[PDB]
Amino acid sequence: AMKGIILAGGTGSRLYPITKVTNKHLLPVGRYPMIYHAVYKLKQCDITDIMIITGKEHMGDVVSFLGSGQEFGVSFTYRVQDKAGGIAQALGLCEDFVGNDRMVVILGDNIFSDDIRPYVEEFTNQKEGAKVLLQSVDDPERFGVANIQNRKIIEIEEKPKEPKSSYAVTGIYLYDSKVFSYIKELKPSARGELEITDINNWYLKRGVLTYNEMSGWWTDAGTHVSLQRANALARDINFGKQFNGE
Amino acid sequence: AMKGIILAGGTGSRLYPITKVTNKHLLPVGRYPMIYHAVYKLKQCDITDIMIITGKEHMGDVVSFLGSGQEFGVSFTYRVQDKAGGIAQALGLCEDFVGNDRMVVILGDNIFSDDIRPYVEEFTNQKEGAKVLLQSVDDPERFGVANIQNRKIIEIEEKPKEPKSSYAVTGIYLYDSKVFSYIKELKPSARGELEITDINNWYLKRGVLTYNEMSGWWTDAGTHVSLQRANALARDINFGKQFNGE
Numbered sequence: 001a002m003k004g005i006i007l008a009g010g011t012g013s014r015l016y017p018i019t020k021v022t023n024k025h026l027l028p029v030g031r032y033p034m035i036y037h038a039v040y041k042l043k044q045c046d047i048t049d050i051m052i053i054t055g056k057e058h059m060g061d062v063v064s065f066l067g068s069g070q071e072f073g074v075s076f077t078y079r080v081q082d083k084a085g086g087i088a089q090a091l092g093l094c095e096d097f098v099g100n101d102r103m104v105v106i107l108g109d110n111i112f113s114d115d116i117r118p119y120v121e122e123f124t125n126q127k128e129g130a131k132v133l134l135q136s137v138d139d140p141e142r143f144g145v146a147n148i149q150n151r152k153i154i155e156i157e158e159k160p161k162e163p164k165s166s167y168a169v170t171g172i173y174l175y176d177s178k179v180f181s182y183i184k185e186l187k188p189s190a191r192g193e194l195e196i197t198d199i200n201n202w203y204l205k206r207g208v209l210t211y212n213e214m215s216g217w218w219t220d221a222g223t224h225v226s227l228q229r230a231n232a233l234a235r236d237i238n239f240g241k242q243f244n245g246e
Numbered sequence: 247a248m249k250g251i252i253l254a255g256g257t258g259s260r261l262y263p264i265t266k267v268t269n270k271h272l273l274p275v276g277r278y279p280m281i282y283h284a285v286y287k288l289k290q291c292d293i294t295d296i297m298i299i300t301g302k303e304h305m306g307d308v309v310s311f312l313g314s315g316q317e318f319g320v321s322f323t324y325r326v327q328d329k330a331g332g333i334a335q336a337l338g339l340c341e342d343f344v345g346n347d348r349m350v351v352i353l354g355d356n357i358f359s360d361d362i363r364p365y366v367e368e369f370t371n372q373k374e375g376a377k378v379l380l381q382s383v384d385d386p387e388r389f390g391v392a393n394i395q396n397r398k399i400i401e402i403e404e405k406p407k408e409p410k411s412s413y414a415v416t417g418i419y420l421y422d423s424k425v426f427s428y429i430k431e432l433k434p435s436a437r438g439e440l441e442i443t444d445i446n447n448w449y450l451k452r453g454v455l456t457y458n459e460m461s462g463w464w465t466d467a468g469t470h471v472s473l474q475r476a477n478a479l480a481r482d483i484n485f486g487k488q489f490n491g492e
């Protein structure tokens with residue numbers, strides 16, 4: 001089987017004061033809270049076993065919205081992310097939840113048009129490793145950047161000052177269970193310094209990373225400008241009576 | 247002196263599921279929570295004694311944002327609005343807070359460009375009564391509508407099926423303390439059926455209602471479409487380090 005993981009932690013400071021009290025991932029994006037989008041993408045892949053990671057202070061509001069998943073035809077489990085570490089350390093918390101299965105990890109503020117199903121199906125037919133999804137963007141300096149040559153990723157660089165390409169590595173990662181070994185057997189405070197790019201480069205060096213360029217639009221929702229854009233793009237998105245309630 | 251009142255109650259159902267957990271007035275409108283806007287308009291009028299009315303379930307989140315007002319150079323008092331009654335019954339809760347002073351009542355989801363100061367100054371020079379602010383709109387059927395003839399309001403009608411005019415009566419009302427007598431000495435369940443328009447028509451019949459047409463833009467933020475519009479219009483609004491924190 002295939003497990004789903006949504007990373008909804010973070011300070012959301014980029015968005016203060018709107019996120020003074022509210023968690024970024026509960027802010028509107030179209031007619032739905034940001035996080036709904038991630039839940040919908042996974043549901044459309046028949047990935048119903050989902051783990052939600054978020055901060056201690058915001059778990060109440062997240063759970064109030066998501067509940068057990070009954071109302072969305074899915075099933076949620078929650079873990080708390082602590083003050084220290086970021087996106088990479090948060091993934092470690094899912095080791096037991098995943099077990100020997102495979103993963104689709106979606107950073108909560110990554111909103112996009114594409115059904116991820118086709119990429120999940122390819123990954124399912126991939127003997128081992130990982131898969132990243134790329135999106136060509138205007139300001140690659142803000143993201144992880146894929147350096148592609150002759151249809152192969154030679155290197156990934158986090159926030160490069162002078163980008164080698166414009167292919168941003170989106171926050172949708174497909175991983176096998178070996179990712180936990182890398183993190184798990186790091187270590188120790190080196191795991192606090194770890195970034196998702198390092199994990200991706202680890203698969204790359206081992207020669208088991210694959211990639212696909214996404215078709216539709218994509219955007220993060222972590223700044224006022226990008227949050228607004230996400231709302232413009234999401235205006236007409238409709239998830240059906242199951243997500244419209246109630 | 248002049249008191250400020252912000253009515254931030256309501257079910258927010260028009261906006262479900264975004265308002266499943268979050269109160270409508272804490273949703274983003276530009277780089278700030280909706281309610282901040284109302285607080286800023288009053289502050290710019292040197293109206294620092296403000297009462298916030300909201301539902302029982304959402305008071306925690308509202309207070310978490312607004313606090314005592316110290317951080318905004320204002321001063322808040324809060325009262326809870328019950329299940330029954332609406333916008334008119336909520337105003338009754340402010341009788342003691344206001345006392346013998348005058349009021350500026352702002353419905354929390356009414357976002358607009360104009361400084362209300364000029365209208366507050368005119369009202370201050372008005373011997374008694376009330377003052378409404380009008381805005382010419384595209385779909386008057388959704389609002390209270392002012393029927394103007396020879397520069398005088400002949401009548402106000404709530405949600406008219408066949409509007410006599412396109413001047414919508416915006417949710418910014420200036421009242422003297424006599425408004426509480428009308429409500430107070432209604433009554434009884436007739437007060438549950440009461441609408442703000444009735445109050446306005448009461449002043450009108452007594453021949454003490456005045457009006458002004460607003461200059462800039464205005465919009466409610468009570469539907470997905472109008473909430474989005476409000477966000478577009480509010481993109482560049484900046485309230486300063488006092489409201490940007492922290």
Ligand SMILES: OC[C@H]1O[C@@](CO)(O[C@H]2O[C@H](CO)[C@@H](O)[C@H](O)[C@H]2O)[C@@H](O)[C@@H]1O
Binds near residue numbers: 142143222
């Ligand atoms: O996803 C939001 C948040 O994640 C950060 C973490 O530093 O960047 C990660 O996600 C990006 C896509 O959102 C990737 O391009 C990047 O490689 C990854 O580190 C923040 O920059 C961003 O605000």
Ligand SMILES: OC[C@H]1O[C@@](CO)(O[C@H]2O[C@H](CO)[C@@H](O)[C@H](O)[C@H]2O)[C@@H](O)[C@@H]1O
Binds near residue numbers: 389404414
């Ligand atoms: O203000 C939001 C909310 O108020 C209602 C209450 O029925 O209408 C009131 O406010 C309007 C402006 O927002 C006025 O035009 C109207 O006269 C007044 O009743 C709702 O219609 C609206 O969603």
